[PDB]
């Protein structure tokens, strides 16, 4: 269902993040030819700090991947479904605070856009965890979207009926009359 | 959808061929080739995949 869909996409996005990050050696930064031919690492390769700090982040998203695969394959019938409320906090709180830092990473003067193989999973998982918390707060029953689409369709049906009867061809003309 | 409901007298659901004819022709050949670009530009970056 809906929460099941979110948890499934979380496990598969984190699986992809790992299977892509480690199974390849390392990325190479943009060269930016002509960038101060001296020092300050402009027009250079990468280094121990970067590589290992990143190899970490991959392990963090693995941890939350395993937490989410556990929750999915366990409470897919959503043992007892409720006291998982413990784990729920551990899956939401962290998430939002993570997002916080990311939401200010542009102000921090960081380049988050050149390398997709690292920041993508982090941003996507933060968003997924936050929307999961939101949907668990109000319990989208995976059938309430059906009621939403039916409401908008009923409105647009009421609109086209008025349009047709006012501007195209009256309903009293096109339909048959009885009794004679 | 509205005009078919008014003409045929019953709302088309996935159990009836009207729904599937509308789906295929209308949606898949008129609304999909641009909603696809909209989603591939604005909603996949909201996930991890590039």
């Amino acid at each position: 269902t809906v929460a099941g869909l979110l948890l499934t996409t979380t496990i598969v996005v984190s699986l992809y993040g790992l299977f892509a990050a480690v199974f390849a050696p390392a990325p190479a930064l943009p060269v930016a030819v002509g960038a101060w031919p001296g020092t300050a690492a402009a027009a250079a390769v990468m280094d121990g700090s970067a590589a290992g700090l990143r190899r970490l982040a991959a392990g963090g998203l693995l941890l939350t991947a395993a937490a989410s695969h556990g929750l999915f394959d366990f409470a897919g019938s959503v043992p007892n479904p409720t006291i998982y409320s413990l784990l729920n906090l551990g899956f939401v709180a962290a998430a939002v605070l993570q997002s916080y830092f990311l939401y200010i990473a542009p102000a921090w003067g960081v380049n988050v856009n050149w390398d997709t193989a690292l920041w993508g999973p982090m941003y996507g998982t933060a968003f997924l965890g936050l929307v999961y918390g939101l949907v668990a707060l109000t319990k989208f029953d995976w059938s309430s979207v059906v009621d939403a689409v039916l409401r908008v369709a009923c409105w647009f049906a009421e609109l086209t009926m008025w349009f047709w009867d006012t501007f195209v061809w009256k309903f009293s003309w096109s339909e048959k009359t009885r009794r004679a | 959808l509205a005009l078919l409901t008014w003409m045929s007298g019953r709302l088309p659901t996935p159990a009836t061929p009207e729904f599937w004819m509308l789906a295929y022709f209308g949606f898949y050949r008129k609304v999909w080739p641009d909603a696809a670009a909209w989603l591939q530009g604005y909603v996949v970056p909201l996930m991890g995949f590039a």
Binding site: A153, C154, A157 | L11
Partner: peptide
Amino acid sequence: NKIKPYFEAYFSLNRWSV
């Protein structure tokens, strides 16, 4: 309001042919 009932039924014949 000729078409609302067909949607409320969810989010709640030419006798000469046979």
